[PDB]
């Protein structure tokens, strides 16, 4: 019902949860209260790193006791990753640089998924990205993770 999450700053966050909430949902509640992006969060319990797709009830937690988790910040670094959403619900992770062309992005999607660049439309903030341009030609806030949507023609 009520659980506690320790942070490196010595602060302790109280959250309201239920056994059927996913770990991802726990990370989302931490984002609501503290503004920390879930992709940065590592939740630790009894030396185990909790998995996003699982529920608290998937873990063997004794409900008599109050549950205390430890939050560690992983990195949003060691390269520049971006994310491309597909119609089949999958999400492709790619490694890119600002000076990569949109066409090069489509080429990387071809290497990973086998989809010809001819057929790819890349969408960002309601804009179709142009093949001859670079990511840096667009005004992308690099402090945020970049998410594109892929549609076929
Ligand atoms: Cu504690
Ligand atoms: Cu490159
Ligand atoms: Cu290729
Ligand atoms: Cu997204």
**Furthest-apart CA pair in the chain: how many Å?**
61
Q: Residue 27: which CATH number?
A: 3.10.20.90
Cα distance between residue 108 and residue 101, in whole Å: 11
- 41 CA to centre of ligand 4 in angstroms: 17
* DSSP state, residue 101: B
Neighbours of 82 (CB within 10 A): 19
Task: Answer left, alpha or beta for residue 27, where phi above 0 means left and psi between -120 and 50 means alpha.
Answer: alpha
| Domain residue limits at 50 | 2-73
- Candidates 135, 128, 153, 145; CA nearest to 77 is 145
Beta strands in the chain (DSSP E): 2-6, 12-16, 41-45, 48-49, 67-73, 81-85, 91-95, 120-124, 127-128, 147-152
With vertex at residue 73, the alpha carbon angle to CA 70 and CA 135, rounded to the nearest 5 degrees, is 155
The structure was resolved experimentally with: X-ray
Could you say which of 21, 44, 73 is where a domain stops?
Answer: 73
- 10 CA to centre of ligand 1 in angstroms: 11
| Nearest ligand for residue 85 CA | 4
Cα distance between residue 62 and residue 41, in whole Å: 23
Same domain, 89 and 119: yes
| Nearest ligand for residue 83 CA | 4
| Nearest ligand for residue 110 CA | 3
Could you say which of 15, 48, 73 is where a domain stops?
Answer: 73
Taken in order 51, 39, 112, 90, the sign of the CA dihedral is positive
Residues near 10 by Cβ (< 8 Å), separated by ≥ 6? none
| Nearest ligand for residue 146 CA | 4
Resolution (A): 2.2
């Amino acid at each position: 019902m009520r659980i506690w999450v320790h942070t490196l700053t010595g602060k302790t966050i109280t959250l309201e949860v239920e056994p059927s909430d996913t770990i991802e949902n726990v990370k989302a509640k931490i984002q609501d209260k503290e503004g920390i992006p879930p992709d940065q969060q590592r939740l630790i319990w009894a030396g185990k790193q909790l998995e996003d797709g699982r529920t608290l009830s998937d873990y063997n937690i004794n409900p008599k006791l109050s549950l205390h988790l430890v939050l560690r910040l992983r990195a949003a670094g060691i390269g520049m990753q971006i994310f491309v959403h597909t119609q089949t619900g999958k999400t492709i992770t790619l490694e890119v640089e600002p000076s990569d062309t949109i066409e090069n992005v489509k080429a990387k999607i071809q290497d990973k998924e086998g989809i010809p660049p001819d057929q790819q439309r890349l969408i960002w903030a309601g804009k179709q990205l142009e093949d001859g341009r670079t990511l840096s030609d667009y005004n992308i806030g690099w402090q945020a993770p970049l998410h594109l949507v892929l549609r076929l023609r």
